[PDB]
Amino acid sequence: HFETVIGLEVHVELKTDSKMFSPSPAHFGAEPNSNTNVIDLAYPGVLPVVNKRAVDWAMRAAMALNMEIATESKFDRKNYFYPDNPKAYQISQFDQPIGENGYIDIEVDGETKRIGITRLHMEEDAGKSTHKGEYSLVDLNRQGTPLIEIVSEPDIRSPKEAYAYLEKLRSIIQYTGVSDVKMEEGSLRCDANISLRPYGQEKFGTKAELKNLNSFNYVRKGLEYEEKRQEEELLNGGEIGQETRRFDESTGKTILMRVKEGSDDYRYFPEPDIVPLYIDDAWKERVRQTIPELPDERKAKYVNELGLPAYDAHVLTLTKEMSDFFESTIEHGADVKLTSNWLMGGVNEYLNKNQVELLDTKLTPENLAGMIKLIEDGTMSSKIAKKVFPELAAKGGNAKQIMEDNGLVQ
Amino acid sequence: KVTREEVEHIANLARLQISPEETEEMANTLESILDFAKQNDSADTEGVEPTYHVLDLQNVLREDKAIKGIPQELALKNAKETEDGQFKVPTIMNEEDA
Amino acid sequence: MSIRYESVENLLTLIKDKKIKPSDVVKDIYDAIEETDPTIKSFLALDKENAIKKAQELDELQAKDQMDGKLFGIPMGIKDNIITNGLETTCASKMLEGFVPIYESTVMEKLHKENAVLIGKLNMDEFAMGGSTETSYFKKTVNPFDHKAVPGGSSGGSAAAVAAGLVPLSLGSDTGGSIRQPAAYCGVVGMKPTYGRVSRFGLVAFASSLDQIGPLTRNVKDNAIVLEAISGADVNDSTSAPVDDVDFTSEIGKDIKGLKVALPKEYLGEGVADDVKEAVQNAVETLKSLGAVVEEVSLPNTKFGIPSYYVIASSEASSNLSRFDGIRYGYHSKEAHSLEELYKMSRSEGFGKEVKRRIFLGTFALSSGYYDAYYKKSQKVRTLIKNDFDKVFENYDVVVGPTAPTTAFNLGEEIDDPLTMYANDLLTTPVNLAGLPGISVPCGQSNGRPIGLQFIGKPFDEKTLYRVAYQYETQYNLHDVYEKL
Ligand SMILES: Nc1ncnc2c1ncn2[C@@H]1O[C@H](COP(=O)(O)OP(=O)(O)O)[C@@H](O)[C@H]1O
Ligand SMILES: [Mg+2]
Structure with missing residues (x-):
């Protein structure tokens, strides 16, 4: 019955070359503790050196979500001991988040609801502690990888809205090319918070962090499951109060794994070792002009300018890459709808059974357009199409070429 | 002020082990340092x-x-x-x- | 021992001229150490083998007439809380006994570049905390001028070794006066450069917003020389200032007539002993006798130095020291059953009483509820202390006053009372808080124990401090004294 106030916590891995405060590589091999250095190892007397692009990229996302980029901004130290957190303090941002008060519009039963995002700051991922028997083994390869947190206001009101938000946020950050946003690769992570407020309570319900959500689909389940969990338990006695919960991927439930005693003291305090950042207006601009046209703006175009199906505009604009390829293929003469079906159909297939990125293949908005026309020319039947594409796709170069570098034409 | 528990809480916050015999002692010392640190209160x-x-x-x-x-x-x-x-x-x- | 007393400058030319051989200078050093350091106990981990080998290399270069470097062949002693690649760096604590770094500190990369020879690692209070070095989990260093009294803190070894004539120069770290306070107690010249003047990368942190590496020498000319050696921007230290002009000798020798000096009353206030007080007042005159204009000013907030220092430092320390848990390096508690224990025991087993008090008080001040009343509060007081200076510097060029309230004290005298020991940094604390450069030089003796005169200059204006400080050195100093001990 009661309202379901819940917000999402999405950590995002930046795909920079080097870690957040160290010059170590951000992409590491399988070999454990082989992608570290004195800094990641927290050896005594080392210092942090802020990754410049990181900041660039961070404030770019913040602006993508329509946040208000801070002018004065510095890092702080989040104190806490844990094997995969060597300094015993993760560098992050307390009061002056590089980003604040943003929002993304989603569409729920019927009409548009605007979910606002409270903040977006820069942190550093921690090492990984493999639990091997009695003892656990520590691997710092990942330690220090740049991260951006995106705290959503508690404006999202359902496990289905939750999905909606995450699906947008992801898509958007994606277009910013600052990350690959893949939960499969853990470069997109979500911690949820749910709490039921009997419609017309003012004071929010009592939230319960929902760890171990490793995918939009999953975040949904846990979210709706826990929604019921406490719904009924709120008919019994019950509080489900200041409690944390892990999500069992097989049963599909929420396991209680602790119960806050008060508030986790981290002794937040401004990192002295890092001079303060002053984001002048010219800085904001540089990174301002780096935000490509976001999905909603593109789709609208597609639907109301290129006379395209709304569903198509969808698929076609899930990821910036394709979207672009699409937009180019058409300014190349290729039929509008025909382009769309080849990207949704043909092309995507190829990409799938070869798990290759659309830009690593050997086709170009040009050589594609070339083939499309040949079809709308009649010069090539759809029969021949399924033949010339596969080759023209990756490790190919021209459209007619395969008709003569092989043998078929008209 | 500075009560046993507080000493243990701090001791717990930073990762330092302290048995009693040293806790009721740290109860005094902390009490002193702090009495000392109250000096800044004369600074406007x-x-x-x-x-x-x-x-x-x-x-x-x-x-x-x-x-x-x-x-x-x-x-x-x-x-x-x-x-x-x-x-x-x-x-x-x-x-x-x- | 033979050149065991020569000054950097003379020990340099004497090598440039080929009268003495690099391996012999080194041969001399160790002779001195082996014959004198067991009494003084200024050193810790020695690096004799790698030193000789380095000298040997230098001799060849001496023959080939290829003697490059602002310190070619000159012996050097480093404070043990400064990473020295491949040696053994302990910050004087059980916690790091055996710790052999796998990287080089910038000051170290630099000196090495200048062909200085690393004789060994100098003692200090465990983790830079303390003002007598008595805490050093390894050995107690005494004062060359009186083996019964402390050599100061926390770079005690750093000043002792130099005052004993065990090396021509050395490096220390200053946080509350950890370089000057000793340089004072031992009648040697100690300088704490403008925060941001010398990289901190490689320096085992104590108080990130305060620490700063500084050189200790037997004279004002050598000191400056050495600073030129280590000052300068560093890409590994976000906080090192991108300052170009690193010529600190240029103006040394020049007169100071017309130089507006400010004698802050607070610096000759109550805390200051009588004999010391007198000594500094003469200096003022030895100063007026020279050209300098000495007018009395005021640094009202000076009294809040120690307290704020204590808090900001302990709080920061509280954090900068959490990284020690014996998991990646240092002391690992064996009686290991849980994870909590691993942390609680490795630390409680590796840190000394004092160091642990700091962290307590440091974690308390930052802890929720007390943050604003202690840490924050303190940070503000710090703001007030920089103003005391800013204002004054609008009308003056440098600030003078005694370096320490009293003359060095005895071992075990104030060791078993925390608060008091801190009362000796009454005159240095303000410096660090304002991130200003301070220099110490002897200006007199008492009961045979030296006294320290201090000059606090505007930021990055060390070339001037050395200036005004060189003139005074020409009127008084302990040059011809160290030789007799
Ligand atoms: N009672 C609640 N019900 C649903 N969501 C909540 C509730 N309280 C807080 N949240 C949301 O959960 C997230 C956590 O906020 P917070 O606890 O302050 O920081 P953190 O997530 O790092 O622990 C926020 O996005 C917030 O909007
Ligand atoms: Mg986080």
């Missing part, structure tokens, strides 16, 4: 900003170019407990809750 700080950095520098950012990580050899060279190429540490979680 109404509306004066806190100094975070003494050096007025600005925007020191490192160019995003990666540098190879040091060999697992070195990373580990100074750690006493290690295996399979990692740092070895207990894990039956926290003492008297785990």
